[PDB]
Symmetry: D2
Subunit: 206 residues, 4 copies
C-alpha cells in the first residue's frame, strides 16, 4: 500500500469550476490497486498554495504526491517532466499577486525533474483510450510554482516521497463561448486514477 | 410525432471506427418527445452514398433527415449551413474514386442551404454543456457530397422534408498517436439526440 | 492588355492597418505581361462597400476584378471558390451594422462560384515560394458580402468580367500582442501581383 | 564598448533542404551595427558533434556574446529561450542517425541552465520593429536544446564572462508549400536576429516586463 496524495486547484476568476479539483475530489478515499488515495484542494495563489501543500503532506504522510492543474488549450492529459524556479505571471493570482522575474527558491536549483514514472503513466492512460503525452513546460504561473515547490520541499525535507505534477485540458462545459479542445470529466478522472495506480505500482519509469 | 432519419458513415481511410455511425446507431429506434428516430449507415463512397440514402428515405419515409459525418480537427458539434455543388477529393473514397473539379449535379445550383433549424440546435446542445457552433463549409469530400445530394433530393422529390448535415469531432481514442481535439462518444451521442428532438419539435429556426 | 481592378478594405474591428489595402495600394499602376493594375479601397461596411465597388467598376471599366480581404489566422494566400448569399456578422462593421440571417440578394442564388482561374493562381503563387490554397468559405462578414455582391453584379450586368475574391493573412505587425500566423507585406503583394497576371493571361482554369 | 557576437545556425535537417537558422545568420557574418561586431558559423544537426563544433567556433572567435539559433517549425514568433534542460530525448534520429532517449547531456550537471542573454529586452526591441517575438520556456529536447544546454554548461564551467543563449525562429514561407504552417520571411527573421545581437551587445542586463 502506497498513500497517494492528489491535489487540485480552487476556482480561478471567471471560471466557476476547476476541473482539476472536481476530478481529484472524486478519487478521495479510493483504494485502487496498491494506491490508497486522499485528495486536498489548493488555492490558486502563489506562496500560499505551497503552505497548504505542506500542511496536506504533514496531515496525510503520503508516499506519493500528484498535483493536478488545468492547462486550457491542451488536448491530452500531460504529466510534466520539469519544474522551473520562476514565477512570471501575466495576470494576478487569486489574491492579486503578480510576480514578474521572481525566483521561487532564492538560491534553489534552476529546475527539478519530476519524481513520477511519467512515461509509464502516459502509456497506461493511452492503453485505456485516453490521449496523453509528456510535457516539458508547466508554464510559469501557479501550476509550475506548486510543481517546483513540491519538488523543492521533497528534496530538502522528505526525499522518500515520489512527487510530480500533471496538467489536464478544459472539460467541455468550459468551452461553450470560445472554441477550445477538452476531455470529459469522466475521462480526466479515470486518467488521474490510472496515474495514481501506476505511480503506486511502479517507482521506476520505463 | 416526426420520423427522424439519422445517417452515419462507415469506417474510412485508416480509421477502424467511424464515430458518426457509432453515435447514430445508438439512437436507432429511440423515441423522445416529438421524435421517433431511425438510423442507417452510408458508405464513405461518392455516388453510392447518395444511392444508399435514397433507399433509406424510400424505406423510412422520414419527416426529418440529419446526415452525420466526422470532421477531424474540429472541437465542437457543428451543424452545417450550406452544401456546395462540387466533388473535389484530395484522397480517394473507400472505393478508389477521387473526383476533381466535378459537379455533384449537372445543372443543379451552386449551393443548397440546410433545411434544419441549426441555430436552435446549437443552442440546445450548448444548454446541455456540449460545445457547438454553425459551420459554413462542409468540405468537398464525401460528407459535403451527401449533404448536397440530400438537399437536391429534397428539392427534387420531397420539399416538405426538413434535412441537413451535422459534422462531429474525433472521439478520444482516435487521437492517441497524433494530438487533436475530440469529444466523447457519449457526448456526441447526446448532442445528436438533442439535434433530432429539437428539429422534430421546431420547424422554424430562431 | 487586360485592365485588372484590385480592391482592398480599410482597417476594421480594432485594427489600425489592413494588409488587403496596404498590398493592393502598392500595386496600383503596376503592369506586367497582359496585366495593367488599378487599385481602389473599399470601406469595411455592409451595403456601402458594394456601392463603392460599383463606382470603381464604372470608373475603371475593368476586364478582371480581384477583391482582396484580411483573413486573420490563415497561413496561406487563399483565393475563394464560393460566395454565399448571407450577411451573418459576428462583430459590427465600421459603422455599427451587425446583420444576422440576412439575404444579400433577396431571391438571388444561394451561392456564386468565383470567376477567376484560382487553381492556376494558387499554383503560380507556390511556384514563387509563397504558400497558397483554395478556400471554400469566405466567411459571412463584409468580405464574403463584397464577393457575393461582385459575382451578382457580374452575372446580372457585366458578364464579360472575370471576377473573384482572395483572402490573405495578417501581416506581422498585426500579431505583436497575440501570437498568430502572418505573411510579410512583400510576399502578399508579390502573390497578388502573380494572381493579377495569371488571371489576365488565362480565362480558363486548370484541373 | 565593442562586442564580438558569435551567431550560429544549423544545417538542414529532417527532410528539409534549407534551414532558415543558418540562411539568416549567414547573412549577418561580418556585419557591424551599434556596438556589435557579428561573426557566424554553421553547426551540424547532430548530437555531441554540434557542441564540439560550437567549442571550435568559440576558440576561433573569442566571442563576448553567443547566440545559437535553430528552427522551431510551427511557431509564429521569434522566440528567445529562457531555459535549457539536461536531457537528450529524440523522437527522430539526428543527421548522423543518433536517437538518444532519456539521456543526461551532463551527467550530474544541473537539471537546467538559464539563458545569459537579456531576452525580455530582445523581445521588446524586435516587437518595436514590427516583428512578433515572445519568450519561450521550452527549447525542446532535440539538438537545439542540446546545443543551448551545452553552451550554458561550457560558459558556466569554462568562460563565465560570456553572455550566451538560444533563439528559435519559425519556418520561412518556402518551407510551408505542402502542408499549411506559420512562417516569417527570411528578411524579417534576419532583421530580428540582427536586433537581438545589437541589443545583447548594447545591454548586459535585462529589463523586467
Amino acid at each position: 500500500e502506497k498513500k497517494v496524495l492528489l491535489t487540485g486547484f480552487d476556482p480561478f476568476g471567471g471560471e466557476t469550476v476547476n476541473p482539476s479539483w472536481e476530478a481529484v475530489k472524486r478519487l478521495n478515499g479510493a483504494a485502487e490497486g496498491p494506491a490508497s488515495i486522499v485528495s486536498e484542494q489548493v488555492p490558486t495563489v502563489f506562496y500560499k498554495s505551497l503552505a497548504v501543500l505542506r500542511e496536506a503532506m504533514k496531515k496525510h504522510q503520503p508516499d506519493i504526491i500528484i498535483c493536478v492543474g488545468q492547462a486550457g488549450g491542451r488536448m491530452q492529459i500531460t504529466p510534466e517532466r520539469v519544474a522551473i524556479n520562476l514565477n512570471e505571471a501575466r495576470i494576478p493570482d487569486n489574491e492579486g499577486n503578480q510576480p514578474v522575474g521572481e525566483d521561487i527558491s532564492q538560491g534553489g536549483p534552476a529546475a527539478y525533474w519530476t519524481g513520477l514514472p511519467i512515461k509509464r503513466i502516459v502509456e497506461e492512460i493511452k492503453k485505456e483510450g485516453i490521449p496523453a503525452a509528456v510535457s516539458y513546460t508547466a508554464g510559469t504561473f501557479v501550476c509550475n510554482h506548486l510543481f517546483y515547490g513540491l519538488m523543492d520541499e521533497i528534496s530538502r525535507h522528505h526525499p522518500h516521497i515520489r512527487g510530480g505534477f500533471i496538467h489536464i485540458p478544459y472539460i467541455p462545459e468550459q468551452t461553450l463561448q470560445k472554441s477550445a479542445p477538452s476531455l470529459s470529466l469522466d475521462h480526466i478522472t479515470k486518467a488521474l486514477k490510472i496515474a495514481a495506480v501506476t505511480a503506486a505500482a511502479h517507482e521506476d519509469d520505463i
